[PDB]
Amino acid sequence: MERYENLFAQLNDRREGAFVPFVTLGDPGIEQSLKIIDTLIDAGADALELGVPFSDPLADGPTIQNANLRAFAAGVTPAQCFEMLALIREKHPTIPIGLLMYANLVFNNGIDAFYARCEQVGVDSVLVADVPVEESAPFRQAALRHNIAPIFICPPNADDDLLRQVASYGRGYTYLLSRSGVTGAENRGALPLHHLIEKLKEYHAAPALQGFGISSPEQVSAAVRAGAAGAISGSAIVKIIEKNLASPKQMLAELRSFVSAMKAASRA
Amino acid sequence: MERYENLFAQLNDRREGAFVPFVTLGDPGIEQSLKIIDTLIDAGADALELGVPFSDPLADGPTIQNANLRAFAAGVTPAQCFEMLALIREKHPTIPIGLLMYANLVFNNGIDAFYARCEQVGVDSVLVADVPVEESAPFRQAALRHNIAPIFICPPNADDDLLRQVASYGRGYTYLLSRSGVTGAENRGALPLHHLIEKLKEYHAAPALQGFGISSPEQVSAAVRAGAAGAISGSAIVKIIEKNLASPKQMLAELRSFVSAMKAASRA
Amino acid sequence: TTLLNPYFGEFGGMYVPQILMPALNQLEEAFVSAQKDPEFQAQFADLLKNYAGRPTALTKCQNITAGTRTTLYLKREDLLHGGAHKTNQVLGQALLAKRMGKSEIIAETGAGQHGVASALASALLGLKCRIYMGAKDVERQSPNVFRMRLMGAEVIPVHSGSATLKDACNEALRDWSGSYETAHYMLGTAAGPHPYPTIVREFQRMIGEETKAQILDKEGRLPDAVIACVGGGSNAIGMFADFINDTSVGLIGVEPGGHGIETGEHGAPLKHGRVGIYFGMKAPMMQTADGQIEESYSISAGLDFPSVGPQHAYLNSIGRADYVSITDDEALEAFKTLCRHEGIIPALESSHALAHALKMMREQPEKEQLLVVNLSGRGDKDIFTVHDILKARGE
Amino acid sequence: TTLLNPYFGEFGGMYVPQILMPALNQLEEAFVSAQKDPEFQAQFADLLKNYAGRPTALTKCQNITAGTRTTLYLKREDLLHGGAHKTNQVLGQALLAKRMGKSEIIAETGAGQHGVASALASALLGLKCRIYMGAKDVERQSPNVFRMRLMGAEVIPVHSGSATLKDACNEALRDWSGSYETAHYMLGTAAGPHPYPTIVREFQRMIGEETKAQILDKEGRLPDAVIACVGGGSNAIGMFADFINDTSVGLIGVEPGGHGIETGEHGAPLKHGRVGIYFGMKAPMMQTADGQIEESYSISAGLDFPSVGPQHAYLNSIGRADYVSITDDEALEAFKTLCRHEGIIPALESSHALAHALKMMREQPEKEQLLVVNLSGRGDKDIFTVHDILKARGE
Ligand SMILES: O=P(O)(O)OCCNS(=O)(=O)c1ccc(OC(F)(F)F)cc1
Ligand SMILES: O=P(O)(O)OCCNS(=O)(=O)c1ccc(OC(F)(F)F)cc1
Ligand SMILES: C=C(/N=C/c1c(COP(=O)(O)O)cnc(C)c1O)C(=O)O
Ligand SMILES: C=C(/N=C/c1c(COP(=O)(O)O)cnc(C)c1O)C(=O)O
Numbered sequence A, B: 001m002e003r004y005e006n007l008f009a010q011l012n013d014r015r016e017g018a019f020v021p022f023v024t025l026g027d028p029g030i031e032q033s034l035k036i037i038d039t040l041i042d043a044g045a046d047a048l049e050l051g052v053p054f055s056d057p058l059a060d061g062p063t064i065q066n067a068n069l070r071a072f073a074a075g076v077t078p079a080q081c082f083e084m085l086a087l088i089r090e091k092h093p094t095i096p097i098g099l100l101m102y103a104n105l106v107f108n109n110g111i112d113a114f115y116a117r118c119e120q121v122g123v124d125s126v127l128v129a130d131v132p133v134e135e136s137a138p139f140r141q142a143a144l145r146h147n148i149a150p151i152f153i154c155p156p157n158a159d160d161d162l163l164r165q166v167a168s169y170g171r172g173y174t175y176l177l178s179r180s181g182v183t184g185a186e187n188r189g190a191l192p193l194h195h196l197i198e199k200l201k202e203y204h205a206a207p208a209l210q211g212f213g214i215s216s217p218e219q220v221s222a223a224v225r226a227g228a229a230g231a232i233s234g235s236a237i238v239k240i241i242e243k244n245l246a247s248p249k250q251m252l253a254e255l256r257s258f259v260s261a262m263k264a265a266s267r268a
Numbered sequence C, D: 001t002t003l004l005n006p007y008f009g010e011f012g013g014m015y016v017p018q019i020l021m022p023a024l025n026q027l028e029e030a031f032v033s034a035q036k037d038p039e040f041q042a043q044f045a046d047l048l049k050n051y052a053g054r055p056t057a058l059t060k061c062q063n064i065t066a067g068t069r070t071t072l073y074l075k076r077e078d079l080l081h082g083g084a085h086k087t088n089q090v091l092g093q094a095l096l097a098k099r100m101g102k103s104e105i106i107a108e109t110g111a112g113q114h115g116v117a118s119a120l121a122s123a124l125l126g127l128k129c130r131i132y133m134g135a136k137d138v139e140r141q142s143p144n145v146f147r148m149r150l151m152g153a154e155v156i157p158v159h160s161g162s163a164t165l166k167d168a169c170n171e172a173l174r175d176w177s178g179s180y181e182t183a184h185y186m187l188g189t190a191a192g193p194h195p196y197p198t199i200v201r202e203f204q205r206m207i208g209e210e211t212k213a214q215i216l217d218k219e220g221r222l223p224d225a226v227i228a229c230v231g232g233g234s235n236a237i238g239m240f241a242d243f244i245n246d247t248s249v250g251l252i253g254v255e256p257g258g259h260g261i262e263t264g265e266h267g268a269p270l271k272h273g274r275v276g277i278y279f280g281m282k283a284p285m286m287q288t289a290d291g292q293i294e295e296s297y298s299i300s301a302g303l304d305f306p307s308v309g310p311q312h313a314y315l316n317s318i319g320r321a322d323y324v325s326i327t328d329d330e331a332l333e334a335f336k337t338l339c340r341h342e343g344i345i346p347a348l349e350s351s352h353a354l355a356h357a358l359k360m361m362r363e364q365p366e367k368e369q370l371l372v373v374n375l376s377g378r379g380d381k382d383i384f385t386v387h388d389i390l391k392a393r394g395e
């Protein structure tokens, strides 16, 4: 399918950036997670980044660590996540869905089989957080064989060779890392570095989404102004879940408010 | 003076061994100690061995260690011990009085001065427990200069050279050690070894008193039968003091009973 | 692109977030340069000799082999400054950190011996040191916490996951992914992403080089086997490396069997896990059916790790080295035996290697065999743990 | 009658109960014989090298002398098996015990390093070991109690007197006076009756011999001074002996000043006591006006002793060696400084020697001086004590 390509063309026509929330699948339980995701979409999410709970998430700070732990406490498994993804796609035929994976979950019972399952449930992209381009060959091959976009990372410390590889190997979107470190809303990244955005464009890379430390509408606007195609926010969203565990109604209301405000900021 | 010589001649004439109790001066206090000593004499002690409290009595087991500690708790000093000795001699003009000393108390403010003080108060002998014959020269010289008998030890492991030195250097009595180890009533020594008694006699040594672990009339009899001139008992006497601290009257009664029984056993 | 091979057969690689690849490439280049720099080699040699106390003794056991045909030597890494082999490669990595213009050190530690080594090297060489240690290990290896703190290191307890070595490793790597501009990650075992398995081996290989020279001097021939415990794999690869091309010499690695392999409470992934990707490497690991990383277990904090260095996985795969396991109780018996019969208090980690050598001797007492055990550390850190167990046991 | 001189000037002798003189004479004869026996010397050398790890390093301090004209080396007895210099002479005395047909060992210990040494040597050489230790020291040096017990030694707490080293010495001697037929008294310091001060020096003298060779190798000249803490005197005489005839080399012994000499709570009898007779020797001791032995005090159990070895008293009297004191607080600062600036955790005993060297440097920072401190042991035994103090201090 061409879900990211279609989205970016539509946003381009509307002179809008994408706003893309991240949540952990099954946090704080399967049923509440599905409701959270529906709320995110209804509130204006242009795409989704969805985490499969993993025991040792080494690119994640405490907020998303704790999201993984909540999902595990609810007994969430990768198999249950794939059931959820199928249900989400059934409801929402065009929204791009990207997974945030750790390598072992992809490698576990065969890389090819993993990407085949992604295709079956209608996932559009997979970002394997601990597989750099240097190690990516079997992952990107399996991805492309199964009509999945493999997502690669452009860090602030990117050199020309990396820029060219990311442009060549990646599909769907390019991840433009705000900063070094791990996920977290307290650690605010820099403005998208224009040098990287304009090099990615030169090399015909997939459109750039800025991620890490994006927690405010101001930052989404700033990403758009800097030439990024959109922005991802995870920890900021997850904090609203964490804060409202005993108040599922308030949780959804506050998620709606936040997502709507972040989306509003993407409009130029 | 010739107090030991006179005693041994008298005992010889009566076909008796000597019974010689040891106590720590000032245990459990000065006044009670003086009463204890009077009781020992009245009950038939032929001579006395009297300890000056010392901080670190390395030839003594727990019983006499604790006697030293009691005297210190009563504030007993060597100066007070010399006052006591003067009072004892004033009451009892002929009984031989021997001190059990540790070297530092003799050496402390001059060896000569120590023996001079002994003479002044009418002490007859000094046994320095941690000075072997090899180190004895200044001690025995000062002793003889002040009419004090220096006492030397014949251990069970005595060789011929030691026997000859002990016979030559010693006066008053020869100490015939029952056994190795330290003072204590629980550790019963052997019978006086006849080989040592008969070698001491051959070399014209001062008469032998057997000491260490003598706690019963049977052992006193056995020492006499073996050819020793008498026997010393310390821990057995001190235990009676220890047992009766809250009952000073019973203490004296039990001391009298024990000393009388030990003395009775010396009669052949 | 790398200067050296990141793989040992199928095992190894550089499975880190993209952010960290420049740091790993920089470290590899610095290592390659340093290895051919006579000044670096002289500085490293000087520290090993005059500060750490190399060479370490090779001690012939006088009592524990009585009535058998086993001759057993112990390579005395317990006598190295700090009390374990960990000190060797820390000195080399600290020099690399300075070669690279880094002012801070991050380290993980389980037994606290790598932590003590990192702290002492940082104190000597003027670096600011922070150490991650699982909260369970802070308790059971408490003497080393005290030592690290007295030497001015920051010790950060890790309460996440199993609160043991893997959790410390996780936090160290998370930290480095944000702090690499100024901090060197002084990884303490022969695992993790390239170039660490290579660097750690090369900075530990004096163990086996000295052993070879010593055993030749004393016996006029090579050992029948060299035996070493295996957590991440540093002391074992350090002992093994110089013998790899001596095909007659057995290489035996001893993983922790914990309460028994059958209980699932162990740290023996090389032989009882399956290949996965975690902690920057493709290596055997203990994992659930779904590919979650399992928590390990050992009485010994230094071996309480659910993976293993890729070079060990490779040496096993080709049959050059053999890997076995030893349970907590077997390790405890070896600990007691060495204390009471040789007057050496070994680390509980090292006790696993000794326990296997004792089994090799006891099972076949008329087999002529010349064995070396790598006595990777001293057991001062373990004495309170072992006491509490032998007491509750009624001894 | 003796084969060797029991005195050093006026100091020394054999002030024991007569019962013990044959045992001392037997020991002297065995020592004299052993010293001229190539087989004994070879056995002793082999144990020192291959079991204990000699020679020990001589480490140049890289940081603590910055901005001064002091060059400071540390003789690393902290790296010896067991963690202190005490191991050297225990191995020699244990061999003597076997030369003499003795099956049991008695030892006293304060810091527990001599106790650990006696236990490890007994385990190796097949002797049954009992150790007397003051009850106060059982608490403040607890890691060593655990170590001694794990190695199969019996540890007997002594509650009498000060419940410290002198009290342990008393009980050991009392025991020996009954058990000498089967037990060797392995006295752990250069004190007590002849021949112990002599034997202990001769079995520790490799410290200074190695130091001389090492400093010549590294500096091409002898030290301006060698500096060692002094309890009973073994580590200091071991460092000093080979330099006694090198008249240019200062010999500086450091007694514990405790809370301050003026408080009377110290362990500095050489300089602040007067001659007496105790523990089998004529030597300076802390004593009351009436000649009772005073209780000593030091933060360090190994220096908490109210007398000193007779050879030190003699070397002082003739002006060959100089003796000074260092307070608890000075020792604590030196401990912290070495931990944080050289990455070495020293024994609190050794910290007294280091503190004096630091004063020599700090007081006269432009004085050119080449100094060696005998780093007599490692501080693992002390880490809990030092922690508790620095915590109560508000650090
Ligand atoms: O808003 P924040 O700071 O929580 O960031 C949320 C990011 N969530 S995500 O799935 O895009 C994401 C993307 C990349 C990650 O690691 C990698 F860069 F190494 F690949 C981890 C998470
Ligand atoms: O009856 P016991 O067992 O208490 O023995 C009491 C002995 N008291 S004493 O003063 O003769 C005495 C005699 C000699 C001593 O030591 C020495 F032999 F080394 F010199 C100690 C005490
Ligand atoms: C986990 C640690 N140490 C492990 C260790 C090990 C196991 O680690 P290697 O497999 O890397 O040698 C072996 N021996 C000793 C004395 C050890 O301390 C640590 O000190 O951090
Ligand atoms: C009292 C003991 N040790 C003393 C000691 C001393 C003081 O003892 P000498 O004066 O005998 O060296 C110095 N350094 C260390 C490391 C020590 O352990 C003992 O271990 O029994």
Ligand code: NA
Binding pocket: C230, C231, C232, C255, C256, C267, C268, C269, C270, C305, C307, C308
């Ligand atoms: Na392992």
Ligand code: NA
Binding pocket: D230, D231, D232, D255, D256, D267, D268, D269, D270, D305, D307, D308
């Ligand atoms: Na002293």
